[model samples]
Target chain A: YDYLFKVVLIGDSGVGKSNLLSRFTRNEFNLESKSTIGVEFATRSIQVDGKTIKAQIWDTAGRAITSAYYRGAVGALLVYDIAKHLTYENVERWLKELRDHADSNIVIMLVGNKSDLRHLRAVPTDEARAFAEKNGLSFIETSALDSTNVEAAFQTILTEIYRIVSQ
Target chain B: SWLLRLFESKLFDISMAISYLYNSKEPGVQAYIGNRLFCFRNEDVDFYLPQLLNMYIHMDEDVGDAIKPYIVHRCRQSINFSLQCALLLGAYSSRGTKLRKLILSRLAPEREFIKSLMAIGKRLATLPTKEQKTQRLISELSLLNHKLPARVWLPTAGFDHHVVRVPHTQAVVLNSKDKAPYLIYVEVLECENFDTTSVPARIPENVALKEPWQEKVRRIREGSPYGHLPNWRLLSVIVKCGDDLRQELLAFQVLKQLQSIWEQERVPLWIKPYKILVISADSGMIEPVVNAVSIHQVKKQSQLSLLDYFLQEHGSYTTEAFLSAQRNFVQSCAGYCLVCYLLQVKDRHNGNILLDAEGHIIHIDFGFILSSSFKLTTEFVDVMGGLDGDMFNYYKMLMLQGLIAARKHMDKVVQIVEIMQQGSQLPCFHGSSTIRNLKERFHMSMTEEQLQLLVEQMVDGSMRS
Candidate 1:
């Protein structure tokens, strides 16, 4: 692997972060899986531009995370549920938390998870896209249940991080 | 009426006002007394210096204006007053930003008080460990030339009856280790009859057991475990100046309520919250848990990890004391684990964990209370007599019961977290989702059996680094 990026999956609770993490790492997702009691981390390698980028994605309970959780994180996927307006609204706050704790140049992606539940969605894609653009973060909608954009989401952030690191 | 009676003897007015303001929370009464003290009793200003500093940081905004003239007066008068007031400019200073800025500019922020505290900390740290005639060194620091205060205010442990006489004691800066540059520590004599001129009275030794080995054993085994002696007290307090202790104070306020809630639920959750008195925005006083050593200090000072220390203290036999201490450890470990797990209180390295004399586990430095992670490492499990023991099972039982009990009153905890969130500046709580996140941390929808497995999984996976 040319790069082993420590990417953190974070946002408000009940937002499919662990699903995305598991889907990407183990290609497994159980709808009835219990809330993460402690942080859950796993690694999977994916080739991008002929370079092996081992994505070591870490996920945890969606609350006040430890300061050390963000210490060396080179990339972050700030995930929120499109079905929960409160979760999407708190994206800016998660960004603020990252700004305070993460490395200054860590690549961040705004993820609207659970895009599969389109009829139940409370957050519109356009609003989130605008929010991401306003914040200068790469944006995408992902559904780990059907495996939509799970690969792309991790790929985008990892490649972004690699691009900056190479330069 | 309290003010009217005091004026009967005009000279005694200063004493009455100070006594009145020491425990006062009413901004109006504080203003009234503070105004009088600044006006008629200008000669006795320094005697009331600390009490005045209290109002300067506290006493609310609208009524805080009356005392500003008095504060400004002292700042312009002497270099000493400038040095003393440098540490206390807090969030309250936000209301009167201009005035606070003026006061800040007149004096160098970290110049005198912290420098003085450091000198005291460094000088006190150099005391010949078990070798110093500490008696002579203490006297040398108390000399007027040493520039230490004669009478220091007791922040949390005073006025059990809520009286106005107030508790101020003569203290010496000994056993001083700052841990970091911004914070500092000193030992205090909690007794009232503090004679600045005389050296502190030493406790009488047990002459009957004069052998060095016996004395050392006696010191470890025979002394009182939880608290200290009444009259000639030796207590440690960390005087924090650089870090805004209002944040620490905020967490304690919430923890105290949580402790109360647990007690009401008949859950003997051992959340031993210490006393913190916030003086200014960034500076305040902290009474460290008495007779308890931090895990870091235990490791550094005794050259034993917490597990090793416990194994040494209680490993020899199933002595009654060992059993008792083990019980204490199991109960407190469960209590703190459940509590910390709920509040998401992270930063659980060796430094923040404290093991008391009776084997109780206490977490301190409440500034970083809420973190999502949980801790119950191998070191902690080994102290519970390993994973297979009845003690470990008891710990899991206690944790399950506590988890179930706390859910019934999750509304209470949520409301408190929400209330603190409004206009709070603490970085630990940044997002509006904090309240929702707290409720989710409780897993409100999960069944007790499911929750049992949840706690069990957490315990089974306790080897997390």
Candidate 2:
């Protein structure tokens, strides 16, 4: 591991934070799981610019967090359920909490999870992208159950954290 | 029939203010009143305990032959616990003797546990000296664990001092880093050996020195070999000896009303309005949070983060204990968060945040309550699993539930502030502003979602520096 970075999952409950962790770290996701499947933490070493950057991914099991939880953390995957409007609306609050507590330059990626649930989607991809761009966060839509962009979500944050720190 | 009228008149007057609480149908009022009622005449409690709670037992149950029994169970639990606390209160006060015989009258179950402790306390009254008596009291009170109830004033007796003892050697200092820092914030006596932990206190040196018990604690260390190391009767108490706690008294009086409102609504937010007995404007005893340990202590001992400590305390990650404790944490976190928001609690170091045995987060030290508010919204959030799990959602849900509960009866809590803020000054109380800010916090016009948006803003801003 050339560089070890800590990345946290942040979102409303039922936004599939645990599944994102599983799909990224173990190539696994439970389709029948109605909620978080007890996956709280994981680690995987990914090649970023051909350097072994290890992402210690944590699926913090609660929506709100202590300020210090951001201490020493280098990246955050701010997640939301694409199907739940309230969860997406609550993303601004989660972002403020993350911004106020997190380090000034920590990498953040706004992830609209459960993209496979297009029929149930309440938050549009373009709206989330605009908000993410306006807020200076990288953005993506992922379906952890289907392994869609789950890898890119974790990979993007880790690479972003690496890009900033490499300077 | 005339005698019945007399008893009814007596009960109505005592419960008039509480009647306002009762219409909302909160059981905690019964439990709260239950503890203090032991101060009544022996025969009075005999009439009131069963009759009052008996009436309660008969009150509505949403029907589960299940609901009725649970109500009966709650009533029975309160009956024993309340009477038990009453006996202990008067049993140790300056009026110890008069209350003893009444307490001695047999109640079938849990009689011995409380009765036996009382027997050891008053029975050994003339135990040579204060040292021996207090030592015996600690050794015996050692056998107890619940939070100690405050001694109430008797309409029928003197404004007697409670029989509480905290040794000079027993002083436990909190926030030791602050200059003129915590004099003796909270003391927990587990060891009998002499290990004095006193500082110059928030006020004068001689003020606390004036007390006879204070002097004995200071005086006895010269030669007294305290061989009595009683059982694991670990006691947690807040002993503020010199500063004017009348400020805190007014705050708690305000808090008592807030708690009453929440309880009456039977809101699930876990707010604690503890007992404070001011011996004077300057000195007094405030009750301790029982069966609980502070977050400060948790960090020092566990050397782990709040979530880590919580997870480790309740067994493994996905265990039954973990799940149950997490459930307890969510609702309680919601509760304290709402109470903290309402009370405007401040100066929050982890010392004021207590984690109980069942995983509830209890806020202690209300010195900042509006004059105070618990600080650090982020710290509380850290306890929820992974930041936005089901537990945090429940936490958010309960916060709204309690917020709605208090707002429905907003004026009840508001009047307390107006009533207390009338004249001069307590540091925490501002003339109309105290009342004004209080009403603003309980804006009843807003939707839950609107209130929730406000919650997010307040919470985000409440992040500690």
Candidate 3:
């Protein structure tokens, strides 16, 4: 069977949203961002049972993909840098933006990226999980650089969305 | 000569015989001792027979034939030895051709050896082919079919290390260090199953659905072969979203069940139905994960129509690749059309429809299925390209093949719909009408010629629109 889903990645700049997308789609991640200039889109197909489900993940530079662009998205990955306290602090700002523009029932994931930065971890896993719980969002910690929980984060949210939709 | 002298002198007793074979991995020595077993009396046979049989069982297939005469001679001497030989040859059914017939001729009807041999034949018959199992893998980097042999590559970084971007698409070298990198197009749901009423309330505070949430976690953890370990090939996954996924999942479930029925009918499908991994579900949304790449990105990057892309990509070979891909495309179109016609999948926009790298067409987004149809669009013509008359005829034939298969198994389809509707309370198919509608689509009552005409007309109408 053929199926398609659109997902958006929104977070403070440098929270590694692009890296996470690249990691999941291309299995490629770099330590730093060359530049966050354009609204980028990538597509990848996965097998569920035996059907082909194509996912189009959208990546953007600070508020670039606005209200109009959030039109068809059924899921969102709200990423934050675990090493950056400020990125975690601004989670609400990004959440509010998605809430304003995205579908009311958009499946949201609170992601703490850069889990490899253990020494500089500013956002604890439990803390992020608590916030995600409060927001009724799924939560996971990922390390795009080391590729830790990167796939789980996407799989968790996608499966969550499937459960909601199939129900 | 020394070995013969020791056995003839009875210098090697039972213990010595066992150790001689156990320590010596040489075949000549094993053969010599096996031959000497013929001279042994019944009492000595019991002690030395198992040890000799154990050594011979582990040897290659040819060893059975060599030992065959010796066991036959022993079979004449004692019923115990005959029964033992019967069991031994029964286990060797596949390895040697003559073993089964030999045992059948020598062994009695009531023997357990016959039962064991029958079980082996049944198991061998029922096992799925290697091709069938390998096709189940979502990622192209398969362990058994290592298309790339020479070098080894590991997944380093996701977006940067092993991936290359080419205009509209990204190519992920699922394996790079090999002589030829296995290039797979990269895509995602970019961001992005069933039922209502008695739909357990949304997982309130993260802790509220904690019980169910943990259950899901347990299931995911158990699903992977490498428990708690990372799924590196997860790079090859698809994400899907729908307001209520139950309808979509129901569509997939029914399609898959239909595919199985068709498969049993020995009818071929243009594409295998994709399955869904329901991660979690609540009131508002549903996301199912898959491992497949879409056709939209493949065409956009190849910068060619589906047929042209195949022509260029496989152009190096004689029309082999292009023709094959074209055939697949035709078959896929026929299957997709039949399924859409049956399910009444109305949203026919290019966005919802996709094609895999392999020329199969996939239709996604069942939100407007059942009684609803996407009102904006008039209709969709076959977008891959117009099929030549011959190709179109071939397409119609395959569609009829599918229809014929479905007709033969209409009862099976009805049973599946009944099961899904009652068990899941699938939102789109809440009542009996939905089930009846599905059964009606099979056109079970139509004759073969009538069904063929109906399919041909549908193909023509789709082409015109």
Candidate 1 is graded, for docking, as incorrect
B1-465: candidate 3 lDDT, tens digit per residue: 244456557466544554554544443344444555555565555533433443345555334333545666666654435555544343322243354355446234324322322232223222245332222222322321121111111111122111111111221222112111112222111110111111111111111111222353444334433233332122322222112334554566567656766778876666455443221231111222232345566656667764556566556325666566666767777777777777777767555666554456667667665645311111222322345457656777888888888777675445534443432334466555877777777777788888878987776666554
Return the top candidate by lDDT. 1
Query: How much is B127 displaced in model 3, in angstroms?
Result: 50
Candidate 2 per-residue lDDT, tens place, B1-465, comes to: 232233335444333332332332432223223333434444433322212322332334211111222223333444333443343333123222333343334343334432333344333345545444444444444343222322211111111222122233443333322111122211222322212222111211121232233343435333222212231112223434344555555556556666666778876666566655443344444565555778888888889988888778788767888778778887777777776777787776787778877787777666766643245455556666645667766776777777888888776566555444433355567434766777887877788779889877765575645
DockQ of each: 0.01, 0.00, 0.00
Candidate rank order under TM-score: 1, 2, 3
Candidate 2 accuracy as lDDT: 0.55
| Alpha-carbon lDDT of model 1 | 0.62
User: What tens digits encode model 1's per-residue C-alpha lDDT throughout B1-465?
Assistant: 233344435545554555555445543344445456555555455534444554545555523444565677677764345534544444434444455567667233234433444344345344544224234334443342232333332434442111111011123332334322122223344443322224333332221221233343334333322115332233335655455676566566556656766788887657787766555664566766655667877788779766678768766436776777878888888878876777767777777888787889888755555531257877778777888989889889888887888887775556545544434556757765766777888898999889989989878665666
Off by over 4 Å in 2: A1-167, B1-237, B371-379, B463-465
Q: How well docked is model 1, in DockQ terms?
A: 0.01
TM-score of each: 0.46, 0.41, 0.35
Instruction: State which candidate, 1 or 3, has the greater TM-score.
Output: 1
